[PDB]
Amino acid sequence: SKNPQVDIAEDNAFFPSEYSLSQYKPYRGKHKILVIAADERYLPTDNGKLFSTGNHPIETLLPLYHLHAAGFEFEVATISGLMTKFEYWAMKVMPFFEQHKSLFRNPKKLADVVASLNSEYAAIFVPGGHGALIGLPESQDVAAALQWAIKNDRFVISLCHGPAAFLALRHGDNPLNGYSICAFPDAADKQTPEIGYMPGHLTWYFGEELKKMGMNIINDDITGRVHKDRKLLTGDSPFAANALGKLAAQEMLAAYA
Amino acid sequence: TSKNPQVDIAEDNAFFPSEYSLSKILVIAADERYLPTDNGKLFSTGNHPIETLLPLYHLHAAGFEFEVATISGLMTKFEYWAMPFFEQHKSLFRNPKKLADVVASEYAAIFVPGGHGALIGLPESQDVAAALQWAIKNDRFVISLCHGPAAFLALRHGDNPLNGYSICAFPDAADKQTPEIGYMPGHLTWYFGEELKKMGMNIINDDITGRVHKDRKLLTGDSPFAANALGKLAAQEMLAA
């Protein structure tokens, strides 16, 4: 069935439709990966209905897995400090998540992390899933985290709707000005209601917005494409999660060697 | 019907209550739905919808327009599990202001509704405290019920102007027993009744009856059964004054 399933937990909130559900030499330093996760599950669509989204689990674990193996551990932070929110309808990888569940369930508040920066962080990771569209793009704290990152020549990793977080640099410096990225294409977000992925359309579109703030989205299709621009690495979709982790590892490894 | 905690698919290891057990004004509501219990399992909770609508509906008639705020700014989280006026004001609950930002800036209130959601964040909020200090230092009304009063725990590490005050509140005893029927997937990691006592407040009830209570500009109820009768009091007290 291509009809949106209901999330009994929330008012007027829907999971993705049933049909679309199946469619759809290490580093021994001290530098950790700062993970910026989503603290809100529900995204409001154009017809009042709520998309039951969150962070996409394969997108956020696969890379973190490749990095963990390459001697790069991680910590998690949300804007509020509230537990991470995962799209569990998109859940080797299991034991990894289980063994690291705590880090996502009890993250730090991003503001606290930012006030202690100057810093054994080797990357900022902003995982995708439409959950990235809630809050991140408006966070002064996300903004600053990102400023710190590029300013101190650190790595920045993202995929899917991850890049929407960069929209937070829209008012200030924007050190990501004139960077190129892979990202989830808007043209795909306009036609996903069709198969009941979401109960409605997005109010605004992140890809269009990033173009206005100087970022070059190099892809308009979903292929699992990954891209490199200096130290900013990105992927276009869930299909890129593995290749992205493969890239993040073999780029932060040669950088730290 | 079984006393089995119903699963909540939206979250990992999260449970609704068992299908058996289910049978100016400034509002500070919960921005988080899941409360962790002592066995790792998450209790799918939030604000109690009847407890935050009935009192506000009585209020809100006799002309008192409410305004919602959560710590983070994220949308209100309601215990929709059973559990007109809602739809009409839904927009205020779904698009609340950050509390911290409302602190820097008029109201005739603070209302802190119940539901176990109130146990998440509020009890430890520097913003909640600062807001709560404002209401007392200005002789404004403070309304709360169920676990709502757990928010007062925010003044803990301050001077505590709520010292001595007496209140109604959901009894710790009753919480120690709800799991045995599936209302909760586990036991609470701590109990606010004891804490409020340690802080220096008088919990004048040890049972659930629907009793509401008044102490200066501080009105409270004990459970959902008090939501209505509480609205009755908040109305009177705000009207006549």
UniProtKB/Swiss-Prot annotation, chain A:
**Inducing stimuli:** By heat shock.
Q: What GO biological process terms are annotated to this protein in UniProt?
A: DNA repair; guanine deglycation; methylglyoxal catabolic process to D-lactate via S-lactoyl-glutathione; protein repair; response to acidic pH; response to methylglyoxal; RNA repair
Describe, from the UniProt record, how activity changes with temperature: Optimum temperature for glyoxalase activity is around 37 degrees Celsius. Optimum temperature for aminopeptidase activity is around 43 degrees Celsius.
Which cellular component terms (GO) are annotated to the entry? cytoplasm; cytosol
Please list the residues that make up the active site.
C160
User: Gene3D superfamilies recorded for this chain?
Assistant: 3.40.50.880
Q: Coiled-coil annotation: which residues?
A: none
Q: Which UniProt keywords apply?
A: Chaperone, Cytoplasm, DNA damage, DNA repair, Hydrolase, Lyase, Metal-binding, Stress response, Zinc
Describe the inactivation phenotype: Cells lacking this gene show a loss of glyoxalase and reduction in aminopeptidase activity. They accumulate methylglyoxal and are more susceptible to methylglyoxal than the parent strain. Cells exhibit growth defects above 48 degrees Celsius and accumulate higher levels of peptides than wild-type. They display increased protein and DNA/RNA glycation levels, and exhibit strong mutator phenotypes.
Catalytic reaction equation(s): methylglyoxal + H2O = (R)-lactate + H(+); N(omega)-(1-hydroxy-2-oxopropyl)-L-arginyl-[protein] + H2O = lactate + L-arginyl-[protein] + H(+); N(6)-(1-hydroxy-2-oxopropyl)-L-lysyl-[protein] + H2O = lactate + L-lysyl-[protein] + H(+); S-(1-hydroxy-2-oxopropyl)-L-cysteinyl-[protein] + H2O = lactate + L-cysteinyl-[protein] + H(+)
The protein's pH behavior is summarized as:
Optimum pH is between 6 and 8 for glyoxalase activity. Significant inhibition of glyoxalase activity below pH 5. Optimum pH is 8 for aminopeptidase activity.
Q: What is the effect of changing E59A?
A: Loss of glyoxalase activity
Q: Which residues bind Zn(2+)?
A: H68, E73, H100
Activity regulation per the record? Answer: The glyoxalase activity is inhibited by copper and zinc cations, activated by ferrous cations, and inactivated by thiol-blocking reagents. The aminopeptidase activity is inhibited by iodoacetamide, dithiothreitol, EDTA and 1, 10-phenanthroline. Binding of ATP at high temperatures induces a conformational change that reduces HchA surface hydrophobicity, interferes with its ability to capture substrate proteins and inhibits chaperone activity.
Localization per record? Cytoplasm
The molecular function terms of the Gene Ontology recorded here are: glyoxalase III activity; protein deglycase activity; protein homodimerization activity; thiolester hydrolase activity; zinc ion binding
Can the keyword DNA damage be found in this entry's annotation? yes
Presence of the UniProt keyword GTP-binding in the record: no
EC number from the UniProt entry: 3.1.2.-, 3.5.1.-, 3.5.1.124, 4.2.1.130
Q: How does it assemble?
A: Homodimer.
The record's family statement is: Belongs to the peptidase C56 family. HchA subfamily.
Entry comment, domain topic: Consists of a large A domain and a smaller P domain connected by a linker. The thermally induced motion of the flexible linker-loop region leads to the uncovering of a high-affinity substrate-binding site that is essential to capture nonnative proteins at high temperatures.
Other remarks on this protein: According to some authors, HchA exhibits an exceedingly weak proteolytic activity against bovine serum albumin (BSA) and some peptidase activity against small single amino acids conjugated to a fluorogenic reporter. Another report showed that HchA does not display any significant proteolytic activity but displays a physiologically relevant aminopeptidase activity.
NCBIfam families documented for this protein: PRK04155.1
Relate the protein's function as given in its record: Protein and nucleotide deglycase that catalyzes the deglycation of the Maillard adducts formed between amino groups of proteins or nucleotides and reactive carbonyl groups of glyoxals. Thus, functions as a protein deglycase that repairs methylglyoxal- and glyoxal-glycated proteins, and releases repaired proteins and lactate or glycolate, respectively. Deglycates cysteine, arginine and lysine residues in proteins, and thus reactivates these proteins by reversing glycation by glyoxals.
> In its UniProt entry, what is this protein called?
Protein/nucleic acid deglycase 1
Species, as recorded? Escherichia coli (strain K12)
